[PDB]
């Protein structure tokens, strides 16, 4: 019958106000859901190349890599070193088969860059915040449910807002701007101009989003086989993509 497998990566970043990356963290998991007959054995093939850790001898370079990996106690690793194959007899229902972590660069560019322009009349109290968001995914690929959260100085009110496209929404709530951008593709540049009154702590911006058909680490499941219909997904998500302004 049916087997579902997902590679799911949670991304966290801290980006400095000048655009330079300070921190990157990916926590990845491979999750399996299946309902197979008695004694059924499954093999999972990963990206052929990929290395684990930081070899003192060989160093570490571009290539697909993770800083550490761990495996469910039922997984047999006899073919992992030579072929990156995992083997196991799954239970009925859900299992996490593998976890991994990456803290060093990504093999691909970060999905979002923000270009803020802030002018603050100290003044009439007028605060103008211009935000341009650039998606640096490929033009084919999509970011879903993108929301930007931006803390604002105490007691700020919205005077006006102009968004670069009709499908965006934005509101002040809970002392912060919430900007929703439900249409975002690689290469998109979306922007918002916000006029507020302040009667610093502006920022940092925190983005949240899902990236379907994507892994931040570059890791992929190459095959899934019995020794049934198959659904294989690769997803990255973030609720902690922090950009100082």
């Amino acid at each position: 019958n049916e087997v579902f497998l997902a590679v799911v990566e949670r991304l966290s970043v801290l980006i400095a106000s000048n655009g330079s990356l300070l921190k990157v963290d990916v926590q990845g998991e491979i999750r399996l859901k299946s309902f197979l007959p008695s004694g059924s054995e499954m093999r999972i093939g990963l990206t052929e190349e990929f290395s684990v850790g930081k070899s003192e001898l060989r160093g570490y370079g571009p290539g697909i890599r993770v800083d550490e990996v761990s495996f469910h106690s039922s997984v047999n690793l006899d073919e992992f070193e030579s072929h990156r194959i995992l083997r196991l007899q799954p239970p009925q229902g859900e299992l996490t088969v593998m976890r991994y972590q990456l803290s060093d660069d990504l093999p691909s560019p970060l999905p979002f860059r923000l270009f803020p322009s802030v002018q603050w009349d100290r003044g009439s109290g007028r605060l103008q915040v211009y935000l341009k968001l650039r998606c640096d995914l490929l033009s084919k690929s999509q970011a879903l449910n993108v929301r930007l959260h931006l803390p604002l100085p105490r007691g700020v009110v919205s005077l006006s807002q102009e968004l670069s496209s009709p499908e965006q929404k934005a509101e002040l709530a809970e002392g912060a701007l919430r900007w929703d951008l439900p249409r975002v593709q690689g290469g998109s540049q979306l922007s918002g101009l916000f006029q507020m009154d302040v009667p610093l702590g502006l920022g940092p911006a925190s983005l949240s989003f899902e990236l379907p058909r994507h892994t931040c680490s570059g890791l992929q499941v190459r095959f899934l086989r019995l020794a049934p219909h198959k659904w294989v997904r690769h997803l990255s998500h973030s609720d902690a993509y922090v950009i100082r302004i």
Binding site: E68, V69, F71, H72, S73, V75, L77
Partner: peptide, 7 residues
């Protein structure tokens, strides 16, 4: 040589 978890 490898780390394992139970869940």
């Amino acid at each position: 040589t490898y780390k394992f978890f139970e869940q």
